[PDB]
Amino acid sequence: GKLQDVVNQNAQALNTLVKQLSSNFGAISSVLNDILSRLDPPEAEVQID
C-alpha cells in the first residue's frame, strides 16, 4: 500500500488536472477554439481571461 498510494495520488492529481480543462469557469464554453472561432476578439479576450 505504501508504494501504491504515491502512484495513485499522482495519477489522481493528473486526472483532476486534465478534468479541470472540461470546466467553464464562467465562460460560455470549455473549448477555447469555439470562442476564438465564434466570438469577436473584443469579447473573445474576456471569455479567454
Binding site: 469577436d40 476578439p41 473584443p42 469579447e43 479576450e45
Partner: protein
C-alpha cells in the same frame, strides 16, 4: 451613429468609415450641427460609405 464611434463597436461607420482600436486612449467629442450643416430642403452633401 455617434454611439458607434467607440472601441469594440460594430456597424456601417465603425466597420467601413472610422474604426477605433480596442485599446483606445483618448476622447470622442460630438455636438449638434443641425443649424450649420443642415440646409432648408435637405442637406444631401455629406456622404458615408
Amino acid at each position: 451613429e455617434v454611439r458607434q464611434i467607440a472601441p469594440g463597436q460594430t456597424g456601417k461607420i465603425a466597420d467601413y468609415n472610422y474604426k477605433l482600436p480596442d485599446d483606445f486612449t483618448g476622447c470622442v467629442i460630438a455636438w449638434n450641427s443641425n443649424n450649420l450643416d443642415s440646409k432648408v430642403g435637405g442637406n444631401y452633401n455629406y456622404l458615408y460609405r
